[PDB]
Design a protein around this nucleic acid. Structure first.
Lengths: 386, 68, 134
RNA sequence: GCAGUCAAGCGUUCAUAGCGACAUUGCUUUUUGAUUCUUCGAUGUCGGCUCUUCCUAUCAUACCGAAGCAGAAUUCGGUAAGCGUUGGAUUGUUCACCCACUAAUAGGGAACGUGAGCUGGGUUUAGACCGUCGUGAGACAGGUUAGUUUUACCCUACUGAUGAAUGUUACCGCAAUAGUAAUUGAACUUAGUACGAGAGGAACAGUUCAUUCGGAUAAUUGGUUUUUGCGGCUGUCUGAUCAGGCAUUGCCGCGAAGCUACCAUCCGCUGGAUUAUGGCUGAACGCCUCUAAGUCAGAAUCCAUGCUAGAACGCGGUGAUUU
RNA sequence: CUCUUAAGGUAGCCAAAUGCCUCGUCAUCUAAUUAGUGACGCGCAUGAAUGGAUUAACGAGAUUCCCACUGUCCCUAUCUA
RNA sequence: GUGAACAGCCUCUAGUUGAUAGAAUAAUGUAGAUAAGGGAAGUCGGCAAAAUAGAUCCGUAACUUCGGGAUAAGGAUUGGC
């Protein structure tokens, strides 16, 4: 009856229902708009969140107080071993949508994706793709038939790829498979490229570069059944309340004689699929390089791995990306990294970053040192030693 | 970038990995952590804090270097 | 208004009701906050000031001609820590402000103690009388 | 209460920029009344708190038009309810009045929303005091103080969580439909420019920041501590010593991990059609006319893009299918 | 000076637990007070054992202010049974 | 035993170890706690909670029925050997 003091709505309604996601692997509901006047390249990637750290770099923002001055920004690390391509998928356009007509596989699939196709691998006969691998045993008549069908039809093309989870220190012997859109000219060229890359690997170095803005797609950290106050940011009721204060007091008016969809109730917090945009890449690094954690100024030979490892993940013995800011999901979650769907000109996408130093001190406590050599030099000899 | 030092042991501080305090005159104090920062508030003496530099180098501990 | 430029987000420690030292010579001891100047609105949220902020305030102890009235003040020292873009977390010991007409000119002639670079860069006439800074 | 009409007059001249007497037609039902149809084998009967939605007769933000509009500031009016619309002193208060910040501090509804949501200050039981009245009992929208606020395990609704039936099982997808969130200001510069006699005094673009809202994250900073992790301290018991028990976690400092904070950080899209309105060509009317045909631009609006779920009876693709 | 009736509120006291008009008026406390305190008192309707005024001390009485204090609150969060 | 003390806390004697249990550690709860900056802005209203708290020394106002007020306020010390 005219709320005596107007204030705004608690929570966002366009992120409903805040239910548990169907999978840990979030769906890509959109890919970048295709430009068919360029080569064939991936529009997105799959990685695993390793953790976070802090970065020093010099600012290039004129008019700002801190132009040509250093700042201290945080970054998330995503370990990204090379992704291997095992399939090609063709979608044709209908008045009901883009519809998958067929999907072609490679001859030799690894036992990781083969593991994905099973729920009990240790006991099973592993007879998934045997009769398919035998279709290859001829010249590939039907295989080229299918590829030609795709060439004829197939408005769009998606590549089935999977991860080398065995290279990450997780114990998840079963890899993550995904469809990735191609955004390059000549569907013919796409499928020939794909066929060339069957059984073959593809690295982030070819797909991403410095200063490119990307979207991040992951599953938010789950928190189970949670109360309305932290799930929605509702005001706590006073101390004097009978029957709870971590509640909503007025759940609805008499008429409409119903509880509305828009009122804050209790339920699932976390484990939502969320798509976060405009995270800048600050480094595209290589596990081959012992000096991943090094910098042009930081000529100390050091990998990105902190002292004692990334907490709850492990060490990085593969390639990686340290990307600005914060990314949905907790450590060990499969993240889908998509290149942005729009041309940025904010001068924040246009600011070329040159790193200056990387924190590689232990995150399992208040780390004060960056290397054990530094530690040994500063402290000296211990009761143990020689 | 500079690596300042704890104002209560002399322990190194990379950026962000500590808090700063300014006393009511101007005297600045860099602390690596709540630990040293709290010891400061408790009005404490590193020359008694067995594990700080200011103790170890009062006691001539570990150096073995000035005669090399 | 009356300040030379902008300011970054900075952590809040002085709501209305709080009381801080008049770190100038103008003749007051305290400075009683009543209102922040920018301070957009929200239900049952209190306008919180910060370092370098202009406010409106009164005196509770000082000269008798200096009390029982409203006037604009400016914060210079904040015990509630904040962060600058250089990652440093810092904080003074106390809450200290001074007095000024709205335009950015002090009534006092001088200042007693350290001051933040933000208020310095943002309020020159203060920045002139300003002794040591940070 | 609110909106219209005619125009006598104001408006220096000028009814109609703005107003508008005498009169007059209407709207609403958030005022208060009139009624007494419903409920007296009972609907919990002030106000506050919290929360959502809705309305426009729009306070501000957007695009506009007009002005006795030079500029600035202001006023009148249109589309618009997309987003917002505060903090405190006194009072039980609604209301009312003050202080102050603000772009603005617009008004109203939903059983005068909301008591198995809270409170119980007020009214409105029993106790007690005063005043006035009454011979007296006792009374008084006259004052004052103290005065038990119950039940959900059910149905629906909502929130989130399962799941049968489709040949089985596994993997990848489509996306019907439903929802949607971005907001507002300041500083610099434009520019002491334009404008103006001066007085004073803009705007567009651009740059940097901020507010409100929202979504994630925990590197760092802070907090939290049953890591009962280390140390210390009291009483007492184990003869001592070491080591340890009990003190409803014995207490204190540190206290990582984990969780968390505008008390930390990061992030918050672009195309079309449109309204008002201004115009094009141009008829009707041999002229005129943005309009009738037809047409260009054009808003914080709509639909899309993007965003969340994925129909459990909507679907496709693919692998495998038992001595 | 009178009528009136038996006499006409004396000392004292107050918008007070009594005052309608009432947020009474002045001052003071406040940034701001329908609150409070002190003062005015033609006081609807104060008042002398139907006890008046004042009053140290005491009050699980009612009321205001101040200092300290504090998660009551801005603004919520974490932990244990 | 500690300690002013039959207080609280631990123990000897004697009696008990019995009050449906098990696994998890979600929300909301009951009881309990701690929390940066601020400090009653909340609220009818400081309800609740916090703070102070023992002993010794020091000093201890107004007003007063001269007895008190008063632990006033208000500062400093406490260990072990």
């Amino acid at each position: 009856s005219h709320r005596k003091y107007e204030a705004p709505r608690h929570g966002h309604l366009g992120f409903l229902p805040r239910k548990r996601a169907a999978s840990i692997r979030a769906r890509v509901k959109a890919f970048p708009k295709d430009d068919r006047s360029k080569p064939v390249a991936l529009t997105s990637f799959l990685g695993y969140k390793a953790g976070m750290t802090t970065i020093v770099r010099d600012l290039d923002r004129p008019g700002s107080k801190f132009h040509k001055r250093e700042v201290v920004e945080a970054v998330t690390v995503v370990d990204t071993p090379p992704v291997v391509v095992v399939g090609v998928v063709g979608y044709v356009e209908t008045p009901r949508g883009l519809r998958s007509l067929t999907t072609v596989w490679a001859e030799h699939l690894s036992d990781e994706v083969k593991r994905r196709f099973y729920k009990n691998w240790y006991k099973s006969k592993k007879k998934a793709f045997t009769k398919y691998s035998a279709k290859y045993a001829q010249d590939g008549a039907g295989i080229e038939r299918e590829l030609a069908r795709i060439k004829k039809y197939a408005s769009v093309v998606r590549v089935l790829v999977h991860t080398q989870i065995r290279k990450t220190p997780l114990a998840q012997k079963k890899a993550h498979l995904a469809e990735i859109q191609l955004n390059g000219g000549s569907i013919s060229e796409k499928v020939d490229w794909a066929r060339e890359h069957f059984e073959k690997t593809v690295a982030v170095d070819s797909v991403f570069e410095q200063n490119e803005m990307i979207d991040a797609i992951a599953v938010t950290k789950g928190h189970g059944f949670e109360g309305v106050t932290h799930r929605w940011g509702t005001k706590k009721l006073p101390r004097k309340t009978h029957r709870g204060l971590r509640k909503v007091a007025c759940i609805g008016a008499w008429h409409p004689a119903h509880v509305m969809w828009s009122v804050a109730r209790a339920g699932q917090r976390g484990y939502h699929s969320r798509t976060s945009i405009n995270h800048k890449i600050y480094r595209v690094g290589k596990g081959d390089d012992e000096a991943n954690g090094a910098t042009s100024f930081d000529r100390t030979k050091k990998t990105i791995t902190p002292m004692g490892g990334f907490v709850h993940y492990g060490e990085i013995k593969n390639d990686f990306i340290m990307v600005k800011g914060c990314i949905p999901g907790n450590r060990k979650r499969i993240v889908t990294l998509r290149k942005s769907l729009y041309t940025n000109t904010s001068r924040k996408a246009l600011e070329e970053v040159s790193l200056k130093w990387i924190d590689t001190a232990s995150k399992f406590g208040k780390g004060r040192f960056q290397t054990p050599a530094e530690k040994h030099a500063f402290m000296g000899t211990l009761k143990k030693d020689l | 970038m500079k690596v300042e030092i704890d104002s209560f042991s002399g322990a190194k501080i990379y950026p962000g990995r500590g808090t700063l305090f300014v006393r009511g005159d101007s005297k600045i104090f860099r602390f690596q952590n709540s630990k040293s920062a709290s010891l400061f508030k408790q009005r404490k003496n590193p020359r008694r804090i067995a594990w700080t530099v200011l103790f170890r180098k009062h006691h001539k501990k570990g150096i073995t270097e000035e005669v090399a | 208004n009356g300040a030379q430029g902008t300011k970054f987000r900075i952590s809040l420690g002085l709501p209305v009701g709080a009381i801080m030292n008049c770190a100038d010579n103008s003749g007051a001891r305290n400075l009683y906050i009543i209102a922040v100047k920018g301070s957009g609105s929200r239900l049952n949220r209190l306008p919180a000031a910060s370092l370098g902020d202009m406010v409106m305030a009164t005196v509770k102890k000082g000269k008798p001609e200096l009390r029982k009235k409203v006037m604009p003040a400016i914060v210079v020292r904040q015990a509630k820590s904040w962060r600058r873009r250089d990652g440093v977390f810092l904080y003074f010991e106390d809450n200290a402000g001074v007095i000024a007409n709205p335009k950015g000119e002090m009534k006092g002639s001088a200042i007693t103690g350290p001051v933040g670079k933000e208020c310095a860069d943002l309020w020159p006439r203060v920045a002139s009388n300003s002794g040591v800074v940070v």
